[PDB]
Structures are given as structure tokens and as C-alpha cells.
Amino acid sequence: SDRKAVIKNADMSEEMQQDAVDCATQALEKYNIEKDIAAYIKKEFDKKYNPTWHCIVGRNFGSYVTHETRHFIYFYLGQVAILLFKEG
Amino acid sequence: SDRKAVIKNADMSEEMQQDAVDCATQALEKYNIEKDIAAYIKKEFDKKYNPTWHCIVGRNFGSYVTHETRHFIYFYLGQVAILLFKEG
């Protein structure tokens, strides 16, 4: 819509990266609270791309996670950072 | 040391919750950058309590994750929030 997608680190097909950005755009259009945004994104990837995804949405965080190959993306959408990854 | 541990949500034995707080205290004493803090905590729980843990450290984030029973803690230590959980 108005928000700039900047992908920072991805281990993920470009189709799926575009999905991630799409999902997060829909989440940001629907929700204002970071946990709700993360939930929307997580639930839709669990549906679309199989469980089990995990999503963190915020302006200030660092992380260290373990993900399945080809199932990791860390990106900005506007001023919010989104970590989305599959493990389990 | 000086930082106040405030546990917000836990699905975890009280022994392990104390370990989590201990680990994060050591991390904060050693590291200033959130990703490094998260890495220290993640790696030590992977060692002490078996893989696979995931750790997020920050002042602003929401999350939605899936964890194994009895292997979840979300807490503050000082002004930083720490999410630490096992999945995989």
C-alpha cells in the first residue's frame, strides 16, 4: 500500500518472500498491535506453507533462532521489523 | 546484579525459569547488543536444556510462536524483554 518492504536476510524462495511481504502488509492494514500483527502472519504461513512458523514483529529486538532450510525471512515493512521462520 | 527480573508468562519449571534469568543476567553482563544477548541465552539453553531453543531480546516487539510444553518463558530483565522458547 504505502509501506516500503526492505528484505534484510532471507533463506526462502522468492515466491514465498513475496508472500511474507503480502501477509505482513495485510497484517499491518488490519492490526496495530505487534503481537496481533505477528499472529496474523504466523497463522497464515502455518496455513499456506505448513506448520510450524514463528513470527516476531517490532521496532527493537535482536534474535537468535534455528530455522529449517529455505524457511527464514527477516525484513522491514515500513518502520517495523518482521522475523518469520519455520521450526518444528 | 542490579537488574530486576519480572517474569510475564512462563510455561516452564521454576528451576528452569531461574536458569533463564541467570543466563540472561550473564548475557547482559557480557554483551550490549540484543542479537548477541539472544545468542548467548539461546546457545546456553541448547547446551543445558537440549536443542532447539530460540531467543528474542528487545525493548519493542510482539510475537506469536509455537513452543513445546513446559519450555516457554517471556520475561523482563531490567528494561529489556526476553522471549525464550523451545521448538524443534
Partner: peptide
């Protein structure tokens, strides 16, 4: 099958 990743906000 897996990798570990670190992320840090700007």
C-alpha cells in the same frame, strides 16, 4: 536441515 540465524533491528 537447519541453520541458526541472528537478527538485529537498525
Amino acid at each position: 536441515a537447519t541453520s541458526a540465524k541472528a537478527t538485529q533491528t537498525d
